[PDB]
Amino acid sequence: SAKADLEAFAKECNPVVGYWDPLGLADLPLWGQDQDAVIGWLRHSEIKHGRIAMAGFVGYIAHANGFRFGGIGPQNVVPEGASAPEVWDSIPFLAKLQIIGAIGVLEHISEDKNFLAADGMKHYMRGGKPGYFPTFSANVHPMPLNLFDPFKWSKNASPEKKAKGLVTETNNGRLAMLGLFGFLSESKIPGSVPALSGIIPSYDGDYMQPFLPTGPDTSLWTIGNLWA
Amino acid sequence: AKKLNPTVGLWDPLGIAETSPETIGWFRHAEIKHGRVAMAAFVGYCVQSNGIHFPWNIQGWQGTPVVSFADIAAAGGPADQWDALSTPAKLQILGVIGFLEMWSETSVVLKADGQEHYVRGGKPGYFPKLSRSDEMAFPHPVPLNLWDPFGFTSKMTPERKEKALLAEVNNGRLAMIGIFGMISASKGLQVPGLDTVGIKPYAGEVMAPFAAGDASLPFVSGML
Amino acid sequence: AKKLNPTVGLWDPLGIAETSPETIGWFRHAEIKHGRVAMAAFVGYCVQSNGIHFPWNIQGWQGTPVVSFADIAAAGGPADQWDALSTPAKLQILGVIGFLEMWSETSVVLKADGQEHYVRGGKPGYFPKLSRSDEMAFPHPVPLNLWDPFGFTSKMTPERKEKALLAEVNNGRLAMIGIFGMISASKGLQVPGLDTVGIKPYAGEVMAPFAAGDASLPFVSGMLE
Ligand code: CLA
Ligand code: CLA
Ligand code: CLA
Ligand SMILES: CCCCCC(=O)OC\C(C=C=C1C(C)(C)C[C@H](OC(C)=O)C[C@@]1(C)O)=C/C=C/C(C)=C/C=C/C=C(C)/C=C/C=C(\C)C(=O)C[C@@]12O[C@]1(C)C[C@@H](O)CC2(C)C
Ligand code: A1ECV
Ligand SMILES: CC(=O)O[C@H]1CC(C)(C)C(=C=C/C(C)=C/C=C/C(C)=C/C=C/C=C(C)/C=C/C=C(\C)C(=O)C[C@@]23O[C@]2(C)C[C@@H](O)CC3(C)C)[C@](C)(O)C1
Ligand SMILES: CC(=O)O[C@H]1CC(C)(C)C(=C=C/C(C)=C/C=C/C(C)=C/C=C/C=C(C)/C=C/C=C(\C)C(=O)C[C@@]23O[C@]2(C)C[C@@H](O)CC3(C)C)[C@](C)(O)C1
Ligand code: KC2
Ligand SMILES: CC1=C(C#C/C(C)=C/C=C/C(C)=C/C=C/C=C(C)/C=C/C=C(C)/C=C/[C@@]23O[C@]2(C)C[C@@H](O)CC3(C)C)C(C)(C)C[C@H](O)C1
């Protein structure tokens, strides 16, 4: 049932390639946690990686072109044109901290069993759908609109349309991971990706260290700024 | 094919005949594709040496490097012309040929077409057509194909197809000795292929001069 | 419409035909709308290039200042005429065009008129009627209309309507060729340019330059083009 679903999803992703597992990670008990939980973790992590890579590709385009919000906010400290690796280099340190904290809050909400069991769902390792995000409906104070469908125009979708959407999501995620690390590899070593030679400048700081080259400590909050 | 020529029979001095059928199909497809590449190399080298330099490269071909196709064509023998092409051009050409090889090797496409032996064994010499269902589905309808793109071979009897495959094999042999007599004649040697024939590269087997990443190899001077 | 001209047939090299019915309806709607817009643009460009400047622009017609209509017309061809109008004028013209487009796309008004699925789907090219009941109830009776304001098309057979639609489609294809050819002839190019044809804009697709808020774009110099 686990590997059979995995074969079916791989066949729908690509009829020619099909199931491609040269490393055989779909047979390894990752924590002594059977087969169902291991493939659920693998699918959830693949889906999360693909979504983050698609968002990162779009954000890299936006910062490399120069697409600032406006005034007052953290965009005011970032210089006008510094390439996308250096826009996570000039925002204040507390902005990076609070961004990573909000991402962790979103991950925790996506994993908290109260949120999942609120809208009738279980954990992806325990038997839930991988990549699913519970709406908001346990968070003490009410939330205005959900995260998957903020305006809820996808509520009429058929299950076949949802399955095709998941397959397209996975394929686009894989290809966006490849493209985004094409960008990051060309920003580190020249001549890796031949197409991106000369477009992306070289960067010296570490990409895998978040607070390396940490930003300044400025207070952008006006009106009653008792935290000087 | 037992014997196309009745006066030749089966010449197997090395004894590679009378072996496993997988090896038989492997050798048959190797000979067929060797002959096809040999005939393509024959016409390509003859056209390149005679001089049919295409009126092309009007912006975007080598705009940054400033290299017209006439400058590449004015290099001598076709081996020198191949040794004068840029690294992206050679890499993308080899990638296109490799992708065609991957499609010719693919098991699901061959078995959906109606063939067998995705080692490229049984039905030797088949290239899958790039159309219809469950292949090349993501955009790219591919109105043309590889073999019979204009449908010149639309109707053929099995006897005519077998005779044309025998013609394939024999003409591939003839052009294979032809192209190697000709490249050896370019490198001195040979029986008598003077025919100007310009100059020669190192061996024509390097397939990647003046490249980057691992091409810091001065080893093409020796090996006797 | 299978084939208006029997000698051409179904020229679909890109394979966009034999698709989903909504996609085919959207493609037919886009073809008809592009042809009509190209024909109207070609007629307007010919009238502007010949010189049809109106006796207008009086009583504060430019926002307290009074700039003459001939002064806007004394810039060259239509491309220079589209870059001399004020930001409010171009913005309000675009807003009127967008209001007409949104009223055309309105499924409530189309279903009231007795039509099919909107975004110009079934029976594409049908502009909804802005009259009668359950439409424009807040004043604005709209004595005129969009299609046949004078009622010149009061009676027409279905076969005559289909023949006129096929003729309109063929003329729209010819106008989509022609208006693009005229713009290209303005920008050098084309075949037999002649006829002075003035100068051309940066691309013709810049829309509204010299505006405020989002028009600080020096990107209209390059991008090849
Ligand atoms: C971290 C991201 C990530 C994750 C978790 C997965 C997870 C999965 N993939 Mg997957 N994939 C990814 C990225 C990812 N993919 C990318 C970027 C591509 C495009 C190249 C693919 C293409 C792909 C195909 C074609 C198929 C899968 C399939 C699968 C599933 C079973 C295979 C398996 O055990 O894992 C895959 C193996 C790993 C994730 C190995 C981990 C990475 C190692 C440890 C590091 C290697 C780094 C190294 C520099 C790479 C060198 C590359 C090159 C030189 C070879 C599994 C859910 C199968 C499927 O569809 O099932 C639904 C399947 O047939 N994947
Ligand atoms: C992959 C994750 C990621 C990360 C880590 C960052 C990080 C950053 N972005 Mg960012 N961005 C992303 C994705 C990401 N971006 C995507 C996908 C987009 C396209 C919508 C943008 C668009 C964007 C703009 C336009 C700006 C930044 C800016 C910034 C910097 C200041 C923090 C801030 O206010 O962010 C704010 C970023 C967001 C709120 C978008 C991220 C939220 C998710 C990933 C996408 C949500 C979709 C979208 C917001 C829906 C909008 C509704 C629509 C109707 C418009 C910081 C370096 C600012 C800056 O200083 O630039 C130099 C700035 O002005 N980003
Ligand atoms: C605090 C925020 C936070 C938290 C709690 C989580 C939590 C989680 N993430 Mg996650 N994530 C976050 C932020 C966060 N995320 C951000 C900002 C991103 C980038 C957009 C991601 C991207 C991401 C991906 C792509 C994936 C996850 C996954 C996961 C899950 C498993 C992770 C795991 O086991 O690794 C545990 C990791 C650690 C214990 C290491 C933490 C880093 C340490 C603390 C650094 C300290 C080292 C340093 C030397 C110390 C400095 C001081 C020292 C000198 C004294 C879990 C639910 C995975 C998942 O859900 O798969 C199913 C997955 O695939 N996350
Ligand atoms: C007063 C009320 C408003 C206050 C707001 C405020 O105070 O600050 C606001 C502010 C700046 C400011 C200010 C102004 C507003 C300009 C004016 C004020 O001026 C005064 C009063 O003085 C205060 C000041 C200076 O502060 C800037 C806000 C910036 C903001 C909000 C930046 C979000 C980035 C999101 C990112 C990077 C996404 C990451 C990516 C994420 C989260 C993911 O990928 C998540 C996900 O993968 C997960 C985890 C699992 C997957 O399954 C699902 C997906 C794929 C989705
Ligand atoms: C319903 C009635 C109506 C009002 C109340 C206004 C608002 C307004 C004011 C007060 C001025 C003058 C301000 C001033 O000079 O003080 C003004 C102007 C223009 N308008 Mg808007 N407008 C259109 C676009 C346009 C253009 C080209 C100009 C000008 O040239 C002129 C202008 O602002 O010059 C810089 C179109 C064409 C599609 C139509 C229309 O009926 O077609 C269907 C209208 C209709 C209305 N307008 N418009
Ligand atoms: C060596 C060489 O030469 O190769 C080059 C090639 C090339 C291409 C130049 C290179 C590159 C870059 C690459 C590969 C970039 C890839 C980028 C990629 C793949 C980016 C995905 C984005 C997906 C998004 C934003 C998802 C939106 C998702 C949306 C909007 C939704 O969820 C909504 C929706 O889904 C619902 C909810 C359901 C349905 O109703 C459908 C819709 C849409 C309405 C490289 C790296 O240089 C290498
Ligand atoms: C305005 C602008 O900027 O646009 C630019 C775009 C662009 C393109 C940059 C421009 C250019 C220049 C050009 C024309 C560049 C392109 C050059 C091109 C396209 C060169 C093809 C080589 C093909 C080869 C070598 C095939 C070998 C195939 C071989 C050797 C095989 O035998 C294949 C094989 O299959 C057989 C047959 C049988 C199979 O059993 C076995 C295999 C698989 C082995 C321009 C003119 O500047 C305009
Ligand atoms: C920035 C993040 C991000 C990106 C870039 C992205 C891209 C795409 C693309 C384009 C490539 C498609 C076509 C697509 C389609 C679907 N998405 Mg994704 N998606 C993102 C975020 C989420 C989240 C948070 C959830 C989600 C889901 C679904 C479902 C519902 C399936 C179902 O209900 O069966 C479908 C059909 C929900 C889900 O449950 O997934 C298991 C859910 O929670 N998505 N998604
Ligand atoms: C590089 C380049 C070009 C090129 C090229 C390419 C790809 C050229 C490729 C050439 C190629 C593909 C050459 C194959 C040779 C295979 C052979 C000879 C196999 C022999 C095997 C033999 C001779 C076995 C012989 C036996 O005798 C033995 C042992 C005993 C006898 O009793 C019996 C038999 C007969 C069985 C272009 C296209 C020309 C122009 C371009 O500009 C420059």
PDB file of C-alpha atoms in Angstrom, chain A residues 19-222:
ATOM      1  CA  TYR A  19       9.854   4.911 -10.032  1.00  0.00           C
ATOM      2  CA  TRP A  20      13.463   6.104  -9.745  1.00  0.00           C
ATOM      3  CA  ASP A  21      15.033   5.257  -6.370  1.00  0.00           C
ATOM      4  CA  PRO A  22      18.718   4.424  -6.922  1.00  0.00           C
ATOM      5  CA  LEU A  23      19.560   5.065  -3.255  1.00  0.00           C
ATOM      6  CA  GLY A  24      16.627   2.996  -1.965  1.00  0.00           C
ATOM      7  CA  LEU A  25      15.716   5.442   0.804  1.00  0.00           C
ATOM      8  CA  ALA A  26      12.103   4.227   0.534  1.00  0.00           C
ATOM      9  CA  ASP A  27      13.183   0.905   2.079  1.00  0.00           C
ATOM     10  CA  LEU A  28      15.205   2.312   4.990  1.00  0.00           C
ATOM     11  CA  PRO A  29      13.449   2.452   8.381  1.00  0.00           C
ATOM     12  CA  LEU A  30      14.498   5.992   9.246  1.00  0.00           C
ATOM     13  CA  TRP A  31      13.713   5.790  12.974  1.00  0.00           C
ATOM     14  CA  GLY A  32      12.543   2.192  13.137  1.00  0.00           C
ATOM     15  CA  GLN A  33       9.218   3.665  12.050  1.00  0.00           C
ATOM     16  CA  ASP A  34       7.822   1.100   9.565  1.00  0.00           C
ATOM     17  CA  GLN A  35       7.279   1.881   5.864  1.00  0.00           C
ATOM     18  CA  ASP A  36       4.195   4.132   5.908  1.00  0.00           C
ATOM     19  CA  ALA A  37       5.731   6.782   8.168  1.00  0.00           C
ATOM     20  CA  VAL A  38       9.035   6.757   6.273  1.00  0.00           C
ATOM     21  CA  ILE A  39       7.418   7.341   2.886  1.00  0.00           C
ATOM     22  CA  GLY A  40       5.148   9.966   4.470  1.00  0.00           C
ATOM     23  CA  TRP A  41       8.174  11.815   5.838  1.00  0.00           C
ATOM     24  CA  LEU A  42       9.978  11.527   2.492  1.00  0.00           C
ATOM     25  CA  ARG A  43       7.005  12.837   0.495  1.00  0.00           C
ATOM     26  CA  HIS A  44       6.364  15.651   2.994  1.00  0.00           C
ATOM     27  CA  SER A  45      10.008  16.742   2.926  1.00  0.00           C
ATOM     28  CA  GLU A  46      10.144  16.593  -0.889  1.00  0.00           C
ATOM     29  CA  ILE A  47       6.964  18.682  -1.128  1.00  0.00           C
ATOM     30  CA  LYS A  48       8.249  21.212   1.431  1.00  0.00           C
ATOM     31  CA  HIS A  49      11.598  21.470  -0.379  1.00  0.00           C
ATOM     32  CA  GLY A  50       9.845  22.031  -3.699  1.00  0.00           C
ATOM     33  CA  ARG A  51       7.507  24.712  -2.338  1.00  0.00           C
ATOM     34  CA  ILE A  52      10.357  26.561  -0.614  1.00  0.00           C
ATOM     35  CA  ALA A  53      12.451  26.326  -3.792  1.00  0.00           C
ATOM     36  CA  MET A  54       9.649  27.730  -5.980  1.00  0.00           C
ATOM     37  CA  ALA A  55       9.142  30.621  -3.548  1.00  0.00           C
ATOM     38  CA  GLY A  56      12.904  31.165  -3.373  1.00  0.00           C
ATOM     39  CA  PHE A  57      13.215  31.265  -7.160  1.00  0.00           C
ATOM     40  CA  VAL A  58      10.481  33.907  -7.437  1.00  0.00           C
ATOM     41  CA  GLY A  59      11.994  35.899  -4.563  1.00  0.00           C
ATOM     42  CA  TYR A  60      15.471  35.672  -6.100  1.00  0.00           C
ATOM     43  CA  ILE A  61      14.088  37.134  -9.334  1.00  0.00           C
ATOM     44  CA  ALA A  62      12.305  39.889  -7.386  1.00  0.00           C
ATOM     45  CA  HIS A  63      15.387  40.909  -5.385  1.00  0.00           C
ATOM     46  CA  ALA A  64      17.831  40.619  -8.295  1.00  0.00           C
ATOM     47  CA  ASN A  65      15.641  42.919 -10.389  1.00  0.00           C
ATOM     48  CA  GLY A  66      14.854  45.258  -7.478  1.00  0.00           C
ATOM     49  CA  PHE A  67      11.245  45.191  -6.303  1.00  0.00           C
ATOM     50  CA  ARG A  68      11.102  47.016  -2.955  1.00  0.00           C
ATOM     51  CA  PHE A  69       7.851  47.476  -1.015  1.00  0.00           C
ATOM     52  CA  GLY A  70       8.096  51.197  -0.323  1.00  0.00           C
ATOM     53  CA  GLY A  71       8.994  53.151   2.805  1.00  0.00           C
ATOM     54  CA  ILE A  72       9.674  52.722   6.545  1.00  0.00           C
ATOM     55  CA  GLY A  73      10.078  48.927   6.469  1.00  0.00           C
ATOM     56  CA  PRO A  74      13.211  46.766   6.248  1.00  0.00           C
ATOM     57  CA  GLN A  75      13.592  47.590   2.540  1.00  0.00           C
ATOM     58  CA  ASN A  76      14.829  51.075   3.525  1.00  0.00           C
ATOM     59  CA  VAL A  77      18.166  49.734   4.826  1.00  0.00           C
ATOM     60  CA  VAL A  78      18.854  47.491   1.819  1.00  0.00           C
ATOM     61  CA  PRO A  79      20.786  49.419  -0.873  1.00  0.00           C
ATOM     62  CA  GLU A  80      19.145  49.958  -4.252  1.00  0.00           C
ATOM     63  CA  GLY A  81      20.655  47.052  -6.175  1.00  0.00           C
ATOM     64  CA  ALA A  82      22.876  44.546  -4.394  1.00  0.00           C
ATOM     65  CA  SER A  83      21.845  41.170  -5.987  1.00  0.00           C
ATOM     66  CA  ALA A  84      19.621  38.617  -4.248  1.00  0.00           C
ATOM     67  CA  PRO A  85      22.306  36.974  -2.010  1.00  0.00           C
ATOM     68  CA  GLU A  86      22.940  40.414  -0.461  1.00  0.00           C
ATOM     69  CA  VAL A  87      19.343  41.342   0.377  1.00  0.00           C
ATOM     70  CA  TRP A  88      19.532  38.766   3.163  1.00  0.00           C
ATOM     71  CA  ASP A  89      22.642  40.700   4.192  1.00  0.00           C
ATOM     72  CA  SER A  90      21.383  44.258   4.826  1.00  0.00           C
ATOM     73  CA  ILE A  91      17.989  43.757   6.517  1.00  0.00           C
ATOM     74  CA  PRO A  92      18.294  44.144  10.319  1.00  0.00           C
ATOM     75  CA  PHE A  93      19.251  41.147  12.440  1.00  0.00           C
ATOM     76  CA  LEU A  94      15.942  41.168  14.310  1.00  0.00           C
ATOM     77  CA  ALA A  95      14.113  41.127  10.965  1.00  0.00           C
ATOM     78  CA  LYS A  96      15.911  37.878  10.080  1.00  0.00           C
ATOM     79  CA  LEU A  97      15.185  36.506  13.565  1.00  0.00           C
ATOM     80  CA  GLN A  98      11.479  37.315  13.363  1.00  0.00           C
ATOM     81  CA  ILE A  99      11.207  35.964   9.799  1.00  0.00           C
ATOM     82  CA  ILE A 100      12.758  32.638  10.839  1.00  0.00           C
ATOM     83  CA  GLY A 101      10.559  32.617  13.944  1.00  0.00           C
ATOM     84  CA  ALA A 102       7.396  33.095  11.890  1.00  0.00           C
ATOM     85  CA  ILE A 103       8.491  30.304   9.532  1.00  0.00           C
ATOM     86  CA  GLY A 104       8.999  28.083  12.576  1.00  0.00           C
ATOM     87  CA  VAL A 105       5.557  29.064  13.872  1.00  0.00           C
ATOM     88  CA  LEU A 106       4.088  28.036  10.506  1.00  0.00           C
ATOM     89  CA  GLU A 107       5.956  24.700  10.609  1.00  0.00           C
ATOM     90  CA  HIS A 108       4.797  24.072  14.183  1.00  0.00           C
ATOM     91  CA  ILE A 109       1.189  24.862  13.229  1.00  0.00           C
ATOM     92  CA  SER A 110       1.536  22.508  10.245  1.00  0.00           C
ATOM     93  CA  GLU A 111       2.715  19.808  12.663  1.00  0.00           C
ATOM     94  CA  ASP A 112       0.641  20.473  15.819  1.00  0.00           C
ATOM     95  CA  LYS A 113      -1.840  17.635  16.344  1.00  0.00           C
ATOM     96  CA  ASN A 114      -4.495  20.065  17.606  1.00  0.00           C
ATOM     97  CA  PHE A 115      -4.503  21.917  14.283  1.00  0.00           C
ATOM     98  CA  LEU A 116      -4.459  18.715  12.212  1.00  0.00           C
ATOM     99  CA  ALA A 117      -7.231  17.026  14.202  1.00  0.00           C
ATOM    100  CA  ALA A 118      -9.324  20.214  14.101  1.00  0.00           C
ATOM    101  CA  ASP A 119     -10.105  19.783  10.394  1.00  0.00           C
ATOM    102  CA  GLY A 120     -10.279  15.976  10.604  1.00  0.00           C
ATOM    103  CA  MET A 121      -6.695  15.045   9.711  1.00  0.00           C
ATOM    104  CA  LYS A 122      -3.827  12.992  11.127  1.00  0.00           C
ATOM    105  CA  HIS A 123      -0.054  13.281  10.947  1.00  0.00           C
ATOM    106  CA  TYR A 124       1.587  12.444   7.626  1.00  0.00           C
ATOM    107  CA  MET A 125       3.837   9.887   9.308  1.00  0.00           C
ATOM    108  CA  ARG A 126       0.850   8.608  11.311  1.00  0.00           C
ATOM    109  CA  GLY A 127      -1.312   8.283   8.187  1.00  0.00           C
ATOM    110  CA  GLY A 128      -2.084  11.778   6.931  1.00  0.00           C
ATOM    111  CA  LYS A 129      -1.723  13.442   3.555  1.00  0.00           C
ATOM    112  CA  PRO A 130       1.854  14.676   2.960  1.00  0.00           C
ATOM    113  CA  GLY A 131       2.222  18.394   2.354  1.00  0.00           C
ATOM    114  CA  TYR A 132      -1.213  19.271   3.751  1.00  0.00           C
ATOM    115  CA  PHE A 133      -1.545  22.401   5.887  1.00  0.00           C
ATOM    116  CA  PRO A 134      -4.333  22.539   8.520  1.00  0.00           C
ATOM    117  CA  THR A 135      -6.317  25.710   8.097  1.00  0.00           C
ATOM    118  CA  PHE A 136      -6.069  27.724  11.337  1.00  0.00           C
ATOM    119  CA  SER A 137      -8.999  26.545  13.377  1.00  0.00           C
ATOM    120  CA  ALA A 138      -7.469  25.995  16.809  1.00  0.00           C
ATOM    121  CA  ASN A 139      -5.327  29.096  17.391  1.00  0.00           C
ATOM    122  CA  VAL A 140      -7.105  30.560  20.474  1.00  0.00           C
ATOM    123  CA  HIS A 141      -7.784  33.954  18.903  1.00  0.00           C
ATOM    124  CA  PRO A 142      -9.578  33.612  15.540  1.00  0.00           C
ATOM    125  CA  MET A 143      -7.729  33.911  12.242  1.00  0.00           C
ATOM    126  CA  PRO A 144      -9.274  35.825   9.316  1.00  0.00           C
ATOM    127  CA  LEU A 145      -8.322  33.670   6.320  1.00  0.00           C
ATOM    128  CA  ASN A 146      -6.444  30.426   5.706  1.00  0.00           C
ATOM    129  CA  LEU A 147      -2.997  29.866   4.157  1.00  0.00           C
ATOM    130  CA  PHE A 148      -3.488  27.258   1.399  1.00  0.00           C
ATOM    131  CA  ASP A 149      -6.504  29.005  -0.137  1.00  0.00           C
ATOM    132  CA  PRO A 150      -6.672  32.558   1.291  1.00  0.00           C
ATOM    133  CA  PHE A 151      -9.650  33.551  -0.858  1.00  0.00           C
ATOM    134  CA  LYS A 152     -11.050  29.992  -1.207  1.00  0.00           C
ATOM    135  CA  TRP A 153     -11.503  29.830  -4.986  1.00  0.00           C
ATOM    136  CA  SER A 154     -10.185  26.236  -5.085  1.00  0.00           C
ATOM    137  CA  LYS A 155     -13.029  24.746  -3.013  1.00  0.00           C
ATOM    138  CA  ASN A 156     -14.854  23.512  -6.145  1.00  0.00           C
ATOM    139  CA  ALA A 157     -11.908  21.454  -7.424  1.00  0.00           C
ATOM    140  CA  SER A 158     -12.482  17.792  -8.241  1.00  0.00           C
ATOM    141  CA  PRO A 159     -10.254  15.131  -6.618  1.00  0.00           C
ATOM    142  CA  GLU A 160      -8.751  14.371 -10.039  1.00  0.00           C
ATOM    143  CA  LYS A 161      -7.903  18.064 -10.445  1.00  0.00           C
ATOM    144  CA  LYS A 162      -6.315  18.037  -6.977  1.00  0.00           C
ATOM    145  CA  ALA A 163      -4.246  14.953  -7.866  1.00  0.00           C
ATOM    146  CA  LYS A 164      -3.041  16.564 -11.104  1.00  0.00           C
ATOM    147  CA  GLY A 165      -2.269  19.708  -9.114  1.00  0.00           C
ATOM    148  CA  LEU A 166      -0.150  17.688  -6.686  1.00  0.00           C
ATOM    149  CA  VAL A 167       1.720  16.015  -9.567  1.00  0.00           C
ATOM    150  CA  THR A 168       2.380  19.391 -11.219  1.00  0.00           C
ATOM    151  CA  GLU A 169       3.459  20.762  -7.825  1.00  0.00           C
ATOM    152  CA  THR A 170       6.016  17.980  -7.366  1.00  0.00           C
ATOM    153  CA  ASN A 171       7.421  18.282 -10.906  1.00  0.00           C
ATOM    154  CA  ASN A 172       7.649  22.083 -10.683  1.00  0.00           C
ATOM    155  CA  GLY A 173       9.210  21.725  -7.243  1.00  0.00           C
ATOM    156  CA  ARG A 174      11.970  19.410  -8.488  1.00  0.00           C
ATOM    157  CA  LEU A 175      12.725  21.644 -11.463  1.00  0.00           C
ATOM    158  CA  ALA A 176      12.741  24.751  -9.243  1.00  0.00           C
ATOM    159  CA  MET A 177      15.167  23.101  -6.801  1.00  0.00           C
ATOM    160  CA  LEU A 178      17.445  22.459  -9.779  1.00  0.00           C
ATOM    161  CA  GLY A 179      17.107  26.043 -11.035  1.00  0.00           C
ATOM    162  CA  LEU A 180      17.584  27.686  -7.638  1.00  0.00           C
ATOM    163  CA  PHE A 181      20.746  25.728  -6.926  1.00  0.00           C
ATOM    164  CA  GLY A 182      21.897  26.601 -10.418  1.00  0.00           C
ATOM    165  CA  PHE A 183      21.682  30.207  -9.223  1.00  0.00           C
ATOM    166  CA  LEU A 184      23.353  29.488  -5.863  1.00  0.00           C
ATOM    167  CA  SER A 185      26.101  27.397  -7.480  1.00  0.00           C
ATOM    168  CA  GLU A 186      26.872  30.098 -10.046  1.00  0.00           C
ATOM    169  CA  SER A 187      27.017  32.616  -7.210  1.00  0.00           C
ATOM    170  CA  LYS A 188      29.790  30.524  -5.580  1.00  0.00           C
ATOM    171  CA  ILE A 189      31.835  28.725  -8.265  1.00  0.00           C
ATOM    172  CA  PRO A 190      32.093  30.125 -11.816  1.00  0.00           C
ATOM    173  CA  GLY A 191      31.522  27.928 -14.831  1.00  0.00           C
ATOM    174  CA  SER A 192      29.196  25.409 -13.183  1.00  0.00           C
ATOM    175  CA  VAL A 193      25.950  26.321 -14.981  1.00  0.00           C
ATOM    176  CA  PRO A 194      27.015  27.497 -18.477  1.00  0.00           C
ATOM    177  CA  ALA A 195      23.856  29.528 -19.139  1.00  0.00           C
ATOM    178  CA  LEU A 196      24.170  31.659 -15.987  1.00  0.00           C
ATOM    179  CA  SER A 197      27.801  32.667 -16.604  1.00  0.00           C
ATOM    180  CA  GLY A 198      28.266  36.408 -16.126  1.00  0.00           C
ATOM    181  CA  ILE A 199      24.706  37.144 -14.966  1.00  0.00           C
ATOM    182  CA  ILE A 200      24.994  36.321 -11.253  1.00  0.00           C
ATOM    183  CA  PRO A 201      27.898  37.963  -9.369  1.00  0.00           C
ATOM    184  CA  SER A 202      30.089  36.029  -6.957  1.00  0.00           C
ATOM    185  CA  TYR A 203      29.358  36.065  -3.220  1.00  0.00           C
ATOM    186  CA  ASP A 204      31.862  35.561  -0.401  1.00  0.00           C
ATOM    187  CA  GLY A 205      29.604  34.949   2.599  1.00  0.00           C
ATOM    188  CA  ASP A 206      28.212  31.584   3.627  1.00  0.00           C
ATOM    189  CA  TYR A 207      24.729  30.736   2.378  1.00  0.00           C
ATOM    190  CA  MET A 208      24.107  28.089   5.047  1.00  0.00           C
ATOM    191  CA  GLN A 209      24.805  30.504   7.931  1.00  0.00           C
ATOM    192  CA  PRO A 210      21.724  32.692   8.532  1.00  0.00           C
ATOM    193  CA  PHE A 211      23.219  35.326  10.751  1.00  0.00           C
ATOM    194  CA  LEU A 212      26.619  35.340   9.184  1.00  0.00           C
ATOM    195  CA  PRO A 213      27.147  38.781   7.758  1.00  0.00           C
ATOM    196  CA  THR A 214      24.396  39.833  10.162  1.00  0.00           C
ATOM    197  CA  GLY A 215      22.535  43.029   9.436  1.00  0.00           C
ATOM    198  CA  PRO A 216      22.581  46.250  11.448  1.00  0.00           C
ATOM    199  CA  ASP A 217      20.674  47.010  14.663  1.00  0.00           C
ATOM    200  CA  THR A 218      18.328  49.863  13.738  1.00  0.00           C
ATOM    201  CA  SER A 219      14.886  50.719  15.103  1.00  0.00           C
ATOM    202  CA  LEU A 220      12.529  51.366  12.190  1.00  0.00           C
ATOM    203  CA  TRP A 221       9.513  51.690  14.521  1.00  0.00           C
ATOM    204  CA  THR A 222       8.287  55.253  15.019  1.00  0.00           C
TER     205      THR A 222
END
